[PDB]
Coordinates of C-alpha atoms in Angstrom, one line a residue:
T1 CA -10.0 51.4 35.5
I2 CA -11.2 47.8 35.4
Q3 CA -9.9 44.4 34.4
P4 CA -10.8 43.1 31.0
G5 CA -13.9 40.9 31.3
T6 CA -17.7 41.0 31.3
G7 CA -20.3 41.6 33.9
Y8 CA -22.9 44.0 35.1
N9 CA -22.5 47.6 36.3
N10 CA -25.4 49.8 37.5
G11 CA -27.9 47.6 35.6
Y12 CA -26.0 47.4 32.3
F13 CA -24.1 44.5 30.8
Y14 CA -20.6 45.5 29.9
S15 CA -17.7 44.0 28.0
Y16 CA -14.1 45.2 28.0
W17 CA -11.5 43.3 26.0
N18 CA -8.0 44.1 24.8
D19 CA -5.1 42.2 23.2
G20 CA -2.7 42.9 26.1
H21 CA -0.5 45.5 24.3
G22 CA -1.2 48.2 26.9
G23 CA -2.1 51.8 26.4
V24 CA -5.9 51.6 27.0
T25 CA -8.0 52.0 30.1
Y26 CA -11.7 51.4 30.5
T27 CA -13.9 52.7 33.3
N28 CA -17.5 52.0 34.3
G29 CA -19.5 55.0 35.6
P30 CA -23.0 55.5 37.0
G31 CA -26.0 54.2 35.1
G32 CA -25.1 53.5 31.5
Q33 CA -21.9 55.5 31.4
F34 CA -18.5 54.3 30.5
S35 CA -15.2 56.0 29.5
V36 CA -12.2 54.9 27.5
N37 CA -8.9 56.6 27.4
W38 CA -6.1 55.3 25.2
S39 CA -2.6 56.2 24.0
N40 CA -0.8 54.2 21.4
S41 CA -3.0 51.2 22.3
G42 CA -3.2 47.8 20.8
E43 CA -6.6 46.3 19.8
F44 CA -9.5 46.7 22.2
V45 CA -13.3 46.9 22.5
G46 CA -15.3 48.2 25.4
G47 CA -18.8 49.3 26.1
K48 CA -22.2 48.9 27.9
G49 CA -25.6 47.5 26.9
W50 CA -27.5 44.2 27.2
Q51 CA -27.0 40.5 27.4
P52 CA -28.9 39.4 25.5
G53 CA -29.8 42.1 23.1
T54 CA -33.0 42.2 21.1
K55 CA -34.0 42.7 17.4
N56 CA -36.2 45.8 18.2
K57 CA -34.3 47.7 20.8
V58 CA -34.2 51.5 20.5
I59 CA -30.7 52.3 21.9
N60 CA -29.9 55.8 23.1
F61 CA -26.3 57.0 23.4
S62 CA -24.8 60.4 24.3
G63 CA -21.4 61.9 25.1
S64 CA -18.0 62.5 23.5
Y65 CA -15.9 60.5 21.2
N66 CA -12.4 61.7 20.2
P67 CA -10.3 59.2 18.4
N68 CA -6.9 59.9 17.0
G69 CA -6.3 57.1 14.5
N70 CA -8.2 53.8 13.9
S71 CA -11.3 53.5 16.1
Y72 CA -15.1 52.9 15.8
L73 CA -18.1 54.0 17.8
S74 CA -21.0 51.6 17.1
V75 CA -23.9 49.6 18.3
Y76 CA -22.0 46.3 18.4
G77 CA -23.0 42.7 19.0
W78 CA -23.4 39.1 18.0
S79 CA -25.9 36.5 17.0
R80 CA -25.5 32.7 17.3
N81 CA -26.7 30.1 14.8
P82 CA -25.7 31.7 12.5
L83 CA -22.7 33.2 14.2
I84 CA -22.6 36.9 13.1
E85 CA -20.7 39.9 14.4
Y86 CA -22.5 43.1 13.6
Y87 CA -22.0 46.9 13.7
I88 CA -24.2 49.9 13.3
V89 CA -21.4 52.4 13.0
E90 CA -22.2 55.9 14.2
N91 CA -18.7 57.4 14.0
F92 CA -15.1 56.3 13.3
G93 CA -11.5 57.7 13.2
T94 CA -9.0 57.3 10.3
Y95 CA -10.5 54.1 8.9
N96 CA -14.0 53.5 7.5
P97 CA -14.5 49.8 8.3
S98 CA -16.4 49.2 5.1
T99 CA -13.4 50.2 2.9
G100 CA -13.2 47.7 0.1
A101 CA -16.3 45.8 1.3
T102 CA -19.1 44.7 -0.9
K103 CA -22.1 47.1 -0.6
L104 CA -25.4 45.3 0.0
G105 CA -27.7 48.3 0.0
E106 CA -28.8 51.4 1.9
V107 CA -31.1 52.1 4.9
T108 CA -32.4 55.4 6.2
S109 CA -32.7 55.6 10.0
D110 CA -32.5 58.1 12.8
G111 CA -31.6 61.1 10.6
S112 CA -29.1 59.6 8.2
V113 CA -28.7 57.2 5.3
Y114 CA -26.5 54.2 6.2
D115 CA -24.6 52.1 3.7
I116 CA -24.9 48.3 4.3
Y117 CA -22.0 45.8 3.8
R118 CA -21.1 42.2 4.5
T119 CA -17.6 41.1 5.1
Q120 CA -16.0 37.8 6.3
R121 CA -13.6 37.1 9.1
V122 CA -11.5 34.0 8.6
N123 CA -10.3 32.0 11.6
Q124 CA -10.7 34.9 14.0
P125 CA -11.7 35.1 17.6
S126 CA -15.4 35.0 18.3
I127 CA -17.9 34.4 21.1
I128 CA -17.6 30.7 20.5
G129 CA -13.9 30.4 19.8
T130 CA -11.8 30.7 16.6
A131 CA -14.1 30.7 13.7
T132 CA -14.9 31.9 10.2
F133 CA -18.1 34.1 10.2
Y134 CA -19.8 37.0 8.5
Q135 CA -19.9 40.5 9.7
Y136 CA -22.8 42.8 8.9
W137 CA -22.3 46.6 8.8
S138 CA -24.5 49.7 8.6
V139 CA -22.2 52.6 8.3
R140 CA -23.7 56.0 9.1
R141 CA -23.0 58.7 6.5
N142 CA -23.4 61.5 8.9
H143 CA -21.1 61.0 11.9
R144 CA -22.2 61.7 15.4
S145 CA -21.5 60.8 19.0
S146 CA -25.0 61.1 20.5
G147 CA -28.4 59.9 19.2
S148 CA -30.9 57.1 19.0
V149 CA -30.5 53.9 17.1
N150 CA -33.6 52.0 16.0
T151 CA -32.0 48.6 15.6
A152 CA -35.0 47.1 14.0
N153 CA -34.6 49.3 11.0
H154 CA -31.1 47.9 10.5
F155 CA -31.9 44.3 11.2
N156 CA -34.9 44.4 8.9
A157 CA -32.9 46.0 6.1
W158 CA -30.2 43.4 6.6
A159 CA -32.8 40.6 6.5
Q160 CA -34.3 42.0 3.3
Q161 CA -30.9 41.9 1.7
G162 CA -30.2 38.2 2.7
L163 CA -28.2 39.1 5.8
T164 CA -29.9 37.1 8.4
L165 CA -29.3 37.1 12.1
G166 CA -29.6 34.1 14.5
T167 CA -30.3 34.3 18.2
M168 CA -29.0 37.5 19.8
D169 CA -26.0 37.4 22.2
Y170 CA -24.8 40.6 23.7
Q171 CA -25.6 44.1 22.3
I172 CA -23.6 47.1 23.4
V173 CA -22.6 50.6 22.5
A174 CA -18.9 50.0 22.0
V175 CA -15.7 52.0 21.5
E176 CA -13.3 49.9 19.5
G177 CA -9.7 50.8 18.7
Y178 CA -6.9 49.3 16.7
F179 CA -3.4 50.7 17.6
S180 CA -4.5 54.3 18.1
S181 CA -5.1 56.9 20.7
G182 CA -8.2 58.8 21.9
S183 CA -10.7 59.4 24.6
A184 CA -14.4 58.7 24.8
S185 CA -17.2 59.1 27.4
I186 CA -20.5 57.6 26.5
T187 CA -23.8 57.1 28.3
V188 CA -26.1 54.3 27.1
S189 CA -29.8 53.6 27.8

């Protein structure tokens, strides 16, 4: 299992972060593979992809995702100027991250309708330090742990709705958890 941080493994950018609570391990495997095992964790995010991402990447992912509690499996990334944290959520555990969020439309992509939302994080950690910034969400209605994500369909639908992205920073397939347990093994390409 590896130290929290970022870097490159077998051609892929990776990012692994946690809040120091304990109870989560992250491992890099061959190619685009990574695994996460967690048991009564704190908050964490780990996954593989690209730095920088693009606005027309077709991301493929496959494997297993078995959360027990609060967790997401998403295409996850950021833009700068404007600072935006975004998710294309393919599956989740006990909590739908759009709960209580304002719905900004729908988009159909890669075999499912997704509901679109915007939320705001206030004075929270970001790629540029503590900040207030928007989050954009596409939440897949039909949950899965393998498939293909045509990111352009999401980014274009967001743009149509007034949810504009700046310059892309990293873009990964991420397993996120908040004080939960689980296991996941995902291969990205």
